[PDB]
Amino acid sequence: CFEADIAIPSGISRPDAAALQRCEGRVVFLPTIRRQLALADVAHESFVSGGVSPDTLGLLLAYRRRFPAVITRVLPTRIVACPVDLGLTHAGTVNLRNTSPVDLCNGDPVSLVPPVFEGQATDVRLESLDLTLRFPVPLPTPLAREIVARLVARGIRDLNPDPDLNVLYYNGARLSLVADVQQLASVNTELRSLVLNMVYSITEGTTLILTLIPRLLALGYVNALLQMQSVTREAAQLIHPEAPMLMRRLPLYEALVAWLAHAGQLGDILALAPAVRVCTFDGAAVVQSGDMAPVIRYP
Amino acid sequence: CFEADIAIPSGISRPDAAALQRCEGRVVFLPTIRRQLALADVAHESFVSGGVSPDTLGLLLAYRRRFPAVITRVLPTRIVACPVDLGLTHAGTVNLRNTSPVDLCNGDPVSLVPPVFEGQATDVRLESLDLTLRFPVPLPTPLAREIVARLVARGIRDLNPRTPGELPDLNVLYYNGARLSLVADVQQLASVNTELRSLVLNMVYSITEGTTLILTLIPRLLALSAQDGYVNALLQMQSVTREAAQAPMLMQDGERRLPLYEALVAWLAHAGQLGDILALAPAVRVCTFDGAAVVQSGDMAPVIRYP
Amino acid sequence: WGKDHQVLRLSMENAVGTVCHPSLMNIDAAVGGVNHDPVEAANPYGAYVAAPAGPGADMQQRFLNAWRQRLAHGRVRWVAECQMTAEQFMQPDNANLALELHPAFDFFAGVADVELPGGEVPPAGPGAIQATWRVVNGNLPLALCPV
Amino acid sequence: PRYHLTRQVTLTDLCQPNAERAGALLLALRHPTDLPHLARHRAPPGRQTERLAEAWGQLLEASESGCARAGLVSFNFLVAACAAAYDARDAAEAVRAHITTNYAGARLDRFSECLRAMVHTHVFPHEVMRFFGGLVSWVTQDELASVTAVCSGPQEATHTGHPGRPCSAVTIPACAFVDLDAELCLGGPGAAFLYLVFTYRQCRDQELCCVYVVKSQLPPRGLEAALERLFGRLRITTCTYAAFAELGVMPDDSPRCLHRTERVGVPVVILEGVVWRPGGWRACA
Amino acid sequence: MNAHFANEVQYDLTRDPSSPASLIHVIISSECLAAAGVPLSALMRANFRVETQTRAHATGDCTPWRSAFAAYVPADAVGALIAPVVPAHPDLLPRVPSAGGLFVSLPVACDAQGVYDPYTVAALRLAWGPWATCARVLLFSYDELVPPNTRYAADGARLMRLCRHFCRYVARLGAAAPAAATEAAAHLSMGLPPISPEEQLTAPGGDTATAEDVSITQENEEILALVQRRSLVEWLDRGWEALAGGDRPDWLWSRRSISVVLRHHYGTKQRFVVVSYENSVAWGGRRARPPRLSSELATALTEACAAERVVRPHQLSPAAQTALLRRFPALEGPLRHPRPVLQPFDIAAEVAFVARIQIACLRALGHSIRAALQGGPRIFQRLRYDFGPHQSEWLGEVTRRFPVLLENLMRALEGTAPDAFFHTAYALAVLAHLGGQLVPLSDDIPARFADSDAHYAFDYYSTSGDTLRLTNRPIAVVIDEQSKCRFMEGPHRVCEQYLPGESYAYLCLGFNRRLCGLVVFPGGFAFTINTAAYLSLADPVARAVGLRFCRGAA
Amino acid sequence: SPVALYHQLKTGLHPGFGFTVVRQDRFVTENVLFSERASEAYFLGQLQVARHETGGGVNFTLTQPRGNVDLGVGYTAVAATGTVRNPVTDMGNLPQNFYLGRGAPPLLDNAAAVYLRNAVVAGNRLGPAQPLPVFGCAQVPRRAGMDHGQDAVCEFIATPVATDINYFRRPCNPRGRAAGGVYAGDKEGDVIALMYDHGQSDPARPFAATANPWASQRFSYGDLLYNGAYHLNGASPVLSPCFKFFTAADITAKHRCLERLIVETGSAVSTATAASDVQFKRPPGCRELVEDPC
Amino acid sequence: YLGRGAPPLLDNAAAVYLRNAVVAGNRLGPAQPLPVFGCAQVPRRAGMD
Amino acid sequence: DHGQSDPARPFAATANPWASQRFSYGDLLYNGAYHLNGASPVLSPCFKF
């Protein structure tokens, strides 16, 4: 466990005190693991990286970088959180607040960005000292990997326009991804940099491989076994893409590292690895929105 | 820890007993899970295969099928090692030694790389027990993923000559400054070839049917180039993207399969996994308790679990 | 006798699992290990095959005059018809003792490199120590199989 | 904290742990009322997606959900239902003589149709029926269920010796001698690393299903190339075959066994003492 | 099987534009290798590399050596395709045995609207190892290789016997067949002896367009009439998918159309097999890209010389020459070249290309031996070997023995075959020098032969008895008034252990990249020879020589 | 041929030559140990263990250190040997199977060797079922019952028939020539000289050189079978009796200072195992503490 | 060029000509250039006085 | 390394190209790796530099 303290700063109001009473059991990110911490390491204003507000890329860099902490008991003058990342595996049971999907008896939930859901939901602001606590969303591993690839696919059809990607049933429920009225116009400008990252790593590599493999095999165990498991797959992709597209070794192999350098970035960026597990005891095995859940430490 | 010991088998060179003292916090690759094991499978003579020693890409493949272990405490009788693959259950955060020219960060994932540096060989020699020791160099993982792409592509240039002898060396590295030159001495072919094939075969499956619609927007990329900052910096100069610019192909069956959404899945399946299938898996993460934001070269950093 | 007042029997059908493996015909390292430190010209009368030349009518008077020289030179490898048994086992009188190695084979000083179905007069000079193959059991020498 | 308890309340329409053993390798049924939808999605359109809409719907016919959701899948329920599928017949089929005499093939026959129907529309049975644990207690009612079958690390196979002084409890059967695939005949001393692999054959054996456990002293990075080798079911081209997750560590290779006595004579392997690292799945190739 | 299939993946090359090609499956059997000079034991010891290059008949250059595949399987090589072997079920198809050999398909030079050029040779090379002694060369013209049509009529009797043998295997074995195999048997009995694969060669039936054979039958069975008034192949897949348990694309074309044609070899009177499947992109396949072959040159130059009874087309009439030249324009080479380095219109035109080089070097040898040995010589010595006191009387013979050798060396240089001469040191030392006027074949040349002129390379002949060669390997001994010898760096041959001229009963004979050779006798008594003053090899003659005998090093 | 020699013996006919048999019985004895008064040292230490808590307490071992020297400059306190309890492994008829392990190039006529494959290994007690995988032991089967004791291994070496029976009326070396590292005179080259150089005579039987030249010389048929360098067996866990005799390194590996020679005979490690149905060659983790004068 | 927020030139022939004309050797000059995620990597020189 | 500037004067690489560079005329004369001078008693003052 090793409970860590976050210091409440000076004079706040009772609704600012009540804002601290509506967050008992949320998820909090922090840079270092000092046993006494302040609120200045917590806020969304502490996420500035280039002088501007971070995007969902700029958050997911930090959301994979800094450290999760879960507030067990709220306090005046302190914030007690028993942090997840310390402790041995499957010990130190902690309690979370669900958001609209289930969080079943297993699932290994993952912290991720707020604007994939309602952006000014869970962006809880302190009014007196004027800071913003944008709490991440704890989604389980199948659906968390599902919704992350859909809006960036929806960003493509929103990029250069001329089915509807947004229905996405759960096991029982119909999950309305679209919060239309004011959010989706802010969606395609807050995942704005991120869509370019999913695109440029595809346009580079595919246009690199179609001048790599024809430059390979004649420049032999990898030669004949290139299309051995790719018979009528890669040569068919050589038949389909190389015809309706365009067609240099020393810049090429220089571009080989650079794309694959960007590839190793995105794997750390994407895919939303599990950090904490739901595997409770004597529950109804099914969590609802706004209800607590016993959550155990390691995947 | 699930304690694992390695004894001091036979004799001691009396200064070299002190050489085992200053290796506290380093990494031993032992290819087992033992309660006791000899020191013969530890050293680089065990890393040498039948007749031939591995290259720095073969040592990646040699560090593939062995098990790293942390030096915990050094006795004159034994050396207690903690099995990284299982026994990382340490709230005490069993400590490691940074032997690397890079001052890291706080919060880096740390993966292990063979000694390939020009001046940090990590060569310590035992002559009473005739063994050679190469300690791995712990590094931050994006800097680790910047290295393995160089060394395979340098061995890609070991297959084809063609070009004039002035090649880009793939031997100048960049971390905030800090010009790094590494060693290019020998490139064994099978370590290059099997690493090259998985670079080919994974990039095969990472293209799908709905992937092809994205290829149409390649001239759309340069339309953002002369009208912003972010895109123009994203578009590299030494890229084929600026070179290839100088269409649905209808085939539409059913059209309720989400073809664009299915493209980003299997692309991420194999092209999304390119650092870890070529190199070692990261399981070491920088975590200092005192609030220190960086960890000096030679320091003892506390180590936490899988990133 | 067993571990009782019990009788036991060992046949030579007993020997089925040992003599019948395909290692009886495994003499690769044998010819190689004996080959270095060579042997001189052992005037190879019986250690060389000639291809035929001309009619058979005069073929003696070829070979009479062709081996007129390296026939009275020394002796052939066999002298053991005069040798009694264990005179082969003793260190003197058998320089060919270190040449009897396999029950199924022969190591003898033959010609070096000339392919066998060819030529008449082989080039006496350096020698070679190779094989032939023992065909039937009677080819064992008569100090090892008594008459 | 090297002792844990987990609990899920389901039906005995599934496993019936009173008909099971003390040691069974239970699966959950996560996303249980799912897959009419993902039958339609994630597949190329030459798969005729109206199959799994009825296929699981015939399963719960044999088994209204109510307030006791369909879950806690046994280890037996996949072996015998794939016994006619994979390359073992009349020995894997002895698991069917274990189920139908103790549990019921009525629920198997609807689900063996699902094992040809789930794999049909690329709805692969990995990441559904997620791992739950080793069936500690069975505080179930008559027709309903309440099981504690702890997840959460090594403590499931430690908390087996302490409760009963005589012999051993659970002791983690393999439930088929065909199962516990004896990989690494190249034998040496160490610890065992257990995994749960679903090997497929897509349109060759008409959407094959397979459930068995591997035996290796191998890392996850030394297991994927071990998943490319030793197979003869490569003859496919769709793709993404041979998923696997970590069943965890058996930190002893000395305590494996060879038996045929359980509960119908079914071959069975005793495995005493296991670090149950719950692991993660992977399916790309 | 798959060596015929994987070479088609090299026929799937396509990409960058070049003269368009074909591919012919050619199965050499046992005695066509054995009569060639191929040891069948050494290739029996399945994927094997074959270095191939193609050669025109009239003039021009050759292809560089192309790495190909092979499958050398001792079996009934015709019967193994026809009756394959399941590991569980080897008696799925009992058959009649036959001879066997290597499975190699070979590519074909064509044209745009391909008219293949006969007399033009593709050259095989089997490499047992690195050395030229571990090498043979094979000759194949397109007259030898290309039939006009195949014989898929023999495929008609084969396929229904397959369905009867699925009707034969389940009825014998019974309930031991699994659930997918007990179905597909009786689905082949509602659709209607061993299989001898050799009868598909010897039954006189082939291909026909059959459109003339429908009208010849429609006007034959209407006489008749006026006076009067899922398939089985889909059940063959489950026949394999249950008995094997998998797809096996090796066996997938054993169910489809297979033609097995017999032809013959113009070099050693041998037989071999021409094969085409249905689904092969190779020649004779029924899935193939145009352009294909045209048997037009094999009918033009024949019938213009057969109807005119012109026995040799240099005796062709001048209008009968140029009218063929107005038809087919690639024949200006073999009809209108003053001295083509390849002989026009002969069978052994590639063989007579070789025998000149065998001749022209011997005169370059024979008039150079006379050059350093014009009169009474003074040779005194060149090496350092000291004597015992009675050892000089051995050289008392070498005075008397001497002059009979230099005839019999040159007699043996005549006495070798030129095919057996190219494995010796002098035939490759010239290639190390003709590449210097390029790496010659088999890489017998070390890495340091091309450094100095002091790196020589020897052969060894027997002095006494018969004057015979005592090597396989050119033994390259580095030589320093006096100069002592030194070897180079490094399956067991007797004489290869000594220094040159070190002992009796050895003649030593070394050569250079400078092509100034040595003749080393025992006792230091040696002398250089300027054979470079006698090698008269014309470069346009020699440029077809080197390209067939060099290897482009990577 | 090996095929013909399979085909002569089952009929029963003497195939031109003979053999010799080398096997290993094993005897549990009750020894007697006299000692002198003051010989050993044997000190004592301290007793505490609070080890790793394994659940419901660690349960509190307490180990103690000791140690002991040979307080005596001579051969104090020695030994005896007097009784024969029971002959643990039987006097037995059980032959040797060379098809147990992979060691040799097979026949190239593959139709012949697979005929002779099961022809030899029809029903040997040392004959496996489901034969050799790539790595691993042959897995010698288990018969349903065993009565007299552990089984013997009767390995055979080809001999000419025309030797003396006088040799073998003595405890002699079965290879036909003295081989052990006792007889050499410390001239650094005589060890292998008596072993293979048959220019000299036998140290044992000096009027001759060998007794079986097929068993004696380098690369002979005796030397080709059981040499440790060639390692024909090594997959098969059946212990060779003849492995002990035929090893060029191991006899040469021994010293010759007599003080250490005799005390190793009091406690040597055998190559056999008294915990297995056959002479399974000694498992690498176990001790045996044999006497072994051979 | 340490920053990247500015929209660049539209002609590419002026884009990476004027970019590397300045950056070419500056004490503040971004070598191994600006990653989308990462830092500008200011060239630290060997000695500073 | 003239890719990095002078630590003494950061706005310039060196102040002399003829001596300060490797294999330049200063290093040819006065570095002791060549010792063009020295079998000689007279002290080169520039040996230390």
Numbering used by the authors:
A (entry chain R): 5 to 166, 174 to 230, 235 to 262, 267 to 318
B (entry chain S): 5 to 165, 168 to 252, 258 to 318
C (entry chain A): 443 to 589
D (entry chain T): 106 to 168, 176 to 215, 220 to 353, 416 to 441, 445 to 466
E (entry chain G): 1 to 45, 54 to 200, 230 to 266, 355 to 562, 569 to 611, 618 to 627, 633 to 696
F (entry chain A): 1032 to 1325
G (entry chain F): 1130 to 1178
H (entry chain E): 1228 to 1276
Give verbatim lines from the article:
Here we show asymmetric reconstructions of herpes simplex virus 2 (HSV-2) B- (containing scaffold proteins inside, putative capsid assembly intermediate), C- (DNA-filled capsid, derived from the enveloped virion by using detergent treatment to remove viral membrane proteins and outer tegument proteins) and virion-capsids (enveloped intact virion) at 8.1, 9.0 and 10.2 Å respectively. The asymmetric reconstructions reveal a unique portal vertex in the context of the icosahedral capsid, including 1 portal, 11 pentons, 3 types of hexons (P, peripentonal; E, edge; C, center) with the hexameric rings formed by VP26s, 320 triplexes (Ta-Tf) and 12 pentagram-shaped capsid vertex specific component (CVSC) densities (composed of a UL17 monomer, a UL25 dimer and a UL36 dimer, presence in C- and virion-capsids). Radially colored representations of the three reconstructions reveal the dodecameric portal situated beneath one of the pentameric vertices; but, the density surrounding the portal displays a five-fold symmetrical assembly, highlighting the symmetry-mismatch structural features. The portal vertex of the capsid is a hub for protein-protein interactions that are important for capsid assembly and genome packaging.
